[model samples]
Target: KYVKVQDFYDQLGKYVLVAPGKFSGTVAATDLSTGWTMAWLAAWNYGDTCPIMHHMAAFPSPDPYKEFEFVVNTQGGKNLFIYGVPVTVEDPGEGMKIYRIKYDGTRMNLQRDAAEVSGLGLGVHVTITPEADGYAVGDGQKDICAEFDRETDMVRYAWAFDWDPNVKDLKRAWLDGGTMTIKRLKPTLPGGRYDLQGSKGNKIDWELVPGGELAIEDGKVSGDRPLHSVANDALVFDPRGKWAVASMRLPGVCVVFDRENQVPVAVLAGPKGTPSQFQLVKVDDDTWTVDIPEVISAGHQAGFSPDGQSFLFMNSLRQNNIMVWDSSNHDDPTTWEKKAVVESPDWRGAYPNTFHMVFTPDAKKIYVTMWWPSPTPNGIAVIDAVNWEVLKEVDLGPDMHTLAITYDGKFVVGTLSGYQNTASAIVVMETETDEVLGFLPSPMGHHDNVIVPRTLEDLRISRSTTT
Candidate 1:
């Protein structure tokens, strides 16, 4: 009998360069997030989890010459397959548990029964790409829980929201519109009291949203007592569900949840309680920058800095008005400078069509969406990153709107957030002639490509910082 190697999804196969060894090419998988999404909790309903979470494994095509085989995992258990064809689901001959495939997306497989896994909550998504050295993959919506185990062809990674998941038995959750994350509160304390609910790290700003207001906590409001500030508009959770930031009660703005820093970045609208107008705090650290751009809501600020060090947003306070270096280095506020701050509105924002946009690879140029919201048309308006002025505009027919410049700045993807499922699209445009080359359907959600060192966490060395 001959042994085999495993498979990988992206360029990671080349990055880790896995070699043959004990447990080097075998695959095992599970998804903790899928489990929670199915439970009867207040968070997800049957409609919410129609397609079960997915888990699968594969060997490098099967025939050393052909090389692709698959092993599946789901709420059911586990099984194997060679090629894209199904080899087994509940076969008893192998004495291994079996799972079945339900839905097949371009990159992910959705199975049924992915909710019965006991004790599993909508916590994290785990997987192993099954490569010789190890398996790993990273996308915007999910985080990874990984361990390179030499015993079982082991490669592991988990995806979690930035809020702590063990808050009481968990009763309900809401999606905060600001940071695009979830908002949740639980009575993790003994007896499950929500009033005493809080997080595990540095407790930053504290404000209370009076009850009877439209916010949610462990349950619903009964009296007129005040709810914690960060507790309202619940967009305080980060990608990993480990911890959460609190939102300030002030409104007319976007609330960004800072994960590594344990608090939410306050991006207030209008002149409210602060000496200044608004603020932008880095979610990774205490480092922050504040700006005073009297902005108009309906239109999204629409642009972030390429380095994550600064943000270049349209201050609709004046409509289509652009400004860069929106924040000053935290060390010195007076030094806050605007590389390119526009005091006028010429195209885009004021047009009601141009809202969201993506920066070029170098982030020197900005591509403004020159299309109206849903039910409108499709086109693009290009602007200069150095000076807030319009450079050019193109209309890519009528079905497209809001485009993104991919890695090489060669492809631009459009969306139908305006039409929902009917509008699901990923139109790739070749900037050379402002031409549309490929169009793929994409679900509207958090997505981005990252440029950073491979994440390697040594569990043995991680200790609780508290004494």
Candidate 2:
């Protein structure tokens, strides 16, 4: 029997590539400091095979197909899809599980209920309690039942697990404006409490004690008292690091700051929020300023260097032209200057609209993808970052929308937009050699192509250490 994308959407398929499996192709995007190469999915709201998290390796190795993992529904239930900007609302009941997404845009999915997690002191149990606002994630033997509760103004979350079992049932939560608070259960702890709250738009940073593990421990993480920092405008959780998100309601995206060193820096340009344009400004760990640039449409996809010195952005309104931002100062947005518009002269006559972009580790070159019905080079473009010139154009495919580069600077990857329910493909190649690796199968109508470096647990460890 032949399978079709519609049949999978109709709940007819029974298997998905949920496990971390090796592939014959490669793709990546990197942050040298953290060794994270994360790619994000910005389209595909409804699809059965649409993978939520597609991870790649950090450093290059002999295995061209190694370390490409996907978070999907193994049983083919309609459980996986882009859940909307990482934290629009995972669920009304379980607070949508804030710890799900990491690296700013990683969309975590419900673990297969039947899939048992092996190799833990206490085996992991994926339980769907009666109050299935969402699934309960905990070490099977622990009382740590953490779930999302939607309140009038904000989302409330409560968990019972802690490093020491004697720890009382503690409660912590967030406000609508992104403020966070932590409290100890009453009548139990006399002067031994973790009760602390913050003003509006503030963020709380913490790290999981005893180092990091891949599987999440509900109560194992510990941190100091709240710090008065940047506004948690999106209320999104990166769990691992201080994320930089640009919400539609908020101007410019948030910046990823090194709390340890007290350096606030901007990362990639995240998904566009409600409105059309974005005048992403720069802010530090404490204060922010605002500014709006030309009325541009949604930034289809954007990326930043590890150092936050360079930014590459492209949107629908300015799709044929790529915009490069040089915030050399990195601290002040006012000093951040937008370079001259980098027009796509080769893609001028056709409807070759650019979508996603990635820069080499050195920030010397940018690789971008575009969508257009062929007879035109509607694929990938290699641009000289300094001259704003298209150095090379390779026909990866028609309707190409997303592109990526590895942390070690060995390869470049690209994907099709999956228009008209098409079966898309992922292409990989060596950046220096320009040798095309074979194409791998991609989901139908898939819109994202991000690079993931290490496992989630390691991801959080890296992010937490910075905070």
Candidate 3:
């Protein structure tokens, strides 16, 4: 429970600097009152006036501390306060789109805005080592990232710190790279027309009949509920047409959409008390809840066909099935059809079942990870994406879980959630020869793995510009 100051400083160094800017203003450990003493130090001044240490309240009397400086007033003493902030992890629960850490000589805090980011969601003992060639490596998410409760089949979303491409991009970034940035725009009502919040301004009229018939008129519905609560596909729309719904993951829920328009229709949550009853909830003027088919029970990982004509939602169940919804005939989601259910059975008598999945470039073939094997082989199942038939089963071990296809579409890579207390490892195969390229021990307990560029040209072309 004790450590050195360097240990504290080292923890803050893992994150990269994104939007760097000056934050010159009053500083206070508590409040911006003159009652608080504060000060600042100057470095090199080129102008005529030199920046001086500003002491808000005199020391040694009421405060009785000479170095007690809580506020700093910036002086143009040929010097503008070079105050800046670091972009750190922002918890989605804070109800902010963006935010960061702000540190004065007195205090440090999560003091910035935030967003929809992707990273190694569950990381432990995450270590970052910078390579002399300008890239960095991150490890430790595999050791303990899987769902522990193992009840609901929800897609896990972590406190994402950066974009995770899963393939093409790993934990490697150029040190001499350009400004990595993200383009974010505040959401506006779709078509600039749609009054979700009625004239009463957040006023609501509701009714609950004998059955699970719950309806809302006017006002804005913004909250959480379970999947089995709401009625099925009851015309839900968001004023801004932008929202998020996670089913089986943390805040487990489902969503419906105007698939044709590529806009959100509603955001739904399953009510715990009524897992069988689907309740219609209005999360906000910009978010609503609609019904989903129970056929597609729970989802863990998701992927799109290489051609973008089909979508795959992998269900996490014993003898779990993959929900293949085809959008080829119609572009809109409403027109999308659940064409096939690709179910993979467990090897042992137990339901340890499957983990992750992916599709080939032509969308002609697909691969799935079959974990915890017994009589049945423990490895990967290669299948005909179009016909939904098992092609060939590739075995590395029963510990296999998530997988990624190479960008060149030439190789298939995967991770192993090793047995019991065994160390995690990786497996690779060449598509051309279907040859097992061999397995290598990776960071202990690593869950997600991706192929990264090790060449200078490859590095420059795909230099990350997002944080």
Candidate 4:
């Protein structure tokens, strides 16, 4: 990669200064033999401290190199080396909760593990932006905001969803596992309190079962299975509330979330009423065989409704589109429908069934941000909900992963994704205008979506600090 060095700091431009002052909130209190106390902060991070080049590390020296000057120093604790900066200590306080640590340079990383955490779960989404600092709250029922000072920095631009409605129960929630899984948290369980871990699905299910309880160990339950996993009215909507279950989305198909236990339920459907499984086969002039994927891409969204009655999955069998099925009425396979083909079925052109389309809040329109049909600017296609017809298409520029609408409805952001989730930046789009607001410039890595955010305002309003 070609590069240039800029002189911004002291003439030497060697040591960069951040958060000038005795950063007193938290510090790594270990004494180095040289009497320099290292506050628990990273030497260099994605946006905060631009990466420094170390041509010497590659050339090798008389002695092996130590990462201490680079990524980490444990003796100094894993946080960061605070140069004895004095700062006041304050609790995040009530509804005015602090979304602590935007990029937990120590615990939460963005450069290497992004695909795993999804940008929405990054520390930036929770912590104060370079501009969101030193602010008190004013009364407002809602606010869809972003900090401009931090806007250029990827870490500053990226944000987690914030909810302001005082009547809401679930604090934050989103689907992960490539949009095949949905996880949410209830205002129940101390807001962030609740049991969940090794369980593959999200931890917030209707009631008692409380999402899926994590298997503390590899094959065991975390607690007593918490007969009350639900945060109260959790399962008043789902039929499979009792099982280890979560919601998922299907690409292109009309279906929303489906149960991971379809096989057991389908097995119960019996052969007499079994819906024929769909398959797609690409013929080769040299080899004659069919390669069926172990798991099919249930197109479009998740289950048919909020109550989780049926599934809207894809059926690539016809070399075209998908089929929708009602798990509640499994006995009647004919209830299925042959949906519209995403792209042309000529085998030489793009197929409608080729993209991951997300559904609107009302399930009336299906949206897919695809890379084809244009070059520089990628595209967004909106489909008719009733007949699955092509409604409209727009060029959105570049590719994105997991386009999700924030619960507060600020922006529909996706991963400023690259091959294998390497890109650290997230692509944010104002859902209202489909305009690329900007990217969340932060650490470049993979992180799962278990991470949640409680905003500074929400933090105060809860603690009664309006004044």
TM-scores of all predicted structures: 0.41, 0.43, 0.42, 0.33
Per-residue lDDT tens digits for candidate 1, residues 398-463, read 334334343445554454332222344444455656655544333331111111112221100000
Estimate candidate 3's alpha-carbon lDDT, on a 0 to 1 scale: 0.31
**Clash totals, every prediction:** 34, 15, 44, 89
Q: If ranked by lDDT, best first, what sequence of candidates would result?
A: 2, 3, 1, 4
Candidate 2 per-residue lDDT over residues 1-467, each given as its tens digit: 88543432232111111111111112223232222334433212323122222221121112212332222111111112122123332331111111122122353332221112211111111211122122222221221212222111111222221121121222211111221111111212233222211111111122111111111123332323222121121111223222222211111233333322333333333223322223323343333332332222323333444345655454333234655566456444434456545775665642565645666666677776656653344677787877888887777664565455544566665566344244466666667856665565554333334444333322221111111
Supply candidate 4's per-residue lDDT for 410: 39
Over the stretch 1-467, how does candidate 4's per-residue lDDT look in tens digits? 65322221112211111110111122121111122222333423432221111000000112111111111101011012111223222221111111222223223222231111221111111112111232111111111111111222211121111212211212211111111111222212332322211111212211111111122112232222222121110000122232111111111112111222211111111011123332222233211111112222222212232222333433322233433334444343334333333343222223322223444444455554444221245555555655656655654444332343333333444442232223334454454545664544323221111101133222111111100
Q: Which candidate leads in TM-score?
A: 2
Residue 232 lDDT (model 4): 12
Q: Point out the higher-scoring one by TM-score: 2 or 4.
A: 2
Candidate 1: C-alpha lDDT? 0.29
Which residue segments of model 1 deviate by more than 4 Å? 1-107, 110-258, 264-276, 279-303, 315-318, 327-339, 342-350, 373-376, 397-402, 417-425, 432-467
Cα lDDT computed for each candidate against the true fold = 0.29, 0.33, 0.31, 0.24
- Model 4 CA lDDT for position 282: 20
